[PDB]
């Protein structure tokens, strides 16, 4: 059986990227984190304090606490037939804002703005629903300067 140390099998997971070692740039510390925000977890090997467990690497969580240089995150973890919302205290260096929620918030803003504009201007309420890409419509293709090229299977050649 395997040993059960904290950093077993993280040889590449906790390593830095090629030609990306050294001093950690400061935007990491300038980023703003508020409780209720969604963050991706990606361990930074250069910082050994407040490191997330390997199980949480690459997962997204919701912030529930904001301390001086760390955040508490609620991350879903599957244990047998239940998903547990584990709470973990991770430092800022291992955290990154999640764009999935921000995209949705932008879409909500656009929807509200479009609805307000249409109602104010008396236009009919617009369609504010994402729809799956439908099958292509009917069209005409012209062969002018694009004559069809007759293709045939090629014979076998002995490429030594």
């Amino acid at each position: 059986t395997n040993s059960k140390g904290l950093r077993r099998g993280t040889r590449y997971m906790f390593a830095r990227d090629f030609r990306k070692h050294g001093v950690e740039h400061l935007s990491t510390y300038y980023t703003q984190y508020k409780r209720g925000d969604l963050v991706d977890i990606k361990t930074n090997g250069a910082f050994q304090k407040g490191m997330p467990f390997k199980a949480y690497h690459g997962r997204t969580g919701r912030i529930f606490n904001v301390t001086r240089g760390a955040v508490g995150i609620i991350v879903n973890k599957r244990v047998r037939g239940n998903i547990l919302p584990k709470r973990i205290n991770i430092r800022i260096e291992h955290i990154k804002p999640s764009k999935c929620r921000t995209d949705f918030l932008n879409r909500v803003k656009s929807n509200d703005e479009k609805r307000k504009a249409a109602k104010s201007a008396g236009q009919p309420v617009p369609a504010l629903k994402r729809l799956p890409v439908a099958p292509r419509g009917a069209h005409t293709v012209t062969t002018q300067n694009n004559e069809p090229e007759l293709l045939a299977p090629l014979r076998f050649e002995i490429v030594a």
Binding site: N65, R78, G81, I83
Partner: protein, 52 residues
């Protein structure tokens, strides 16, 4: 008579038989495990807001 025999064979089926239960929605409402100083200020703020 070897009797270690570990395996994970029939475990996902057992897990999924009654479904995989996702966490509830009120779990984000609790203020448990939050900074004590923030909690103290929240108590003070809530204890003073005039109702009307």
């Amino acid at each position: 008579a070897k009797s270690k025999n570990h395996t994970n064979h029939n475990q996902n089926k057992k897990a999924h038989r009654n479904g995989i239960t996702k966490p509830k929605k009120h779990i984000f409402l609790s203020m448990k495990g939050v900074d004590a100083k923030f909690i103290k200020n929240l108590r003070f703020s809530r204890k003073n807001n005039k109702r009307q």
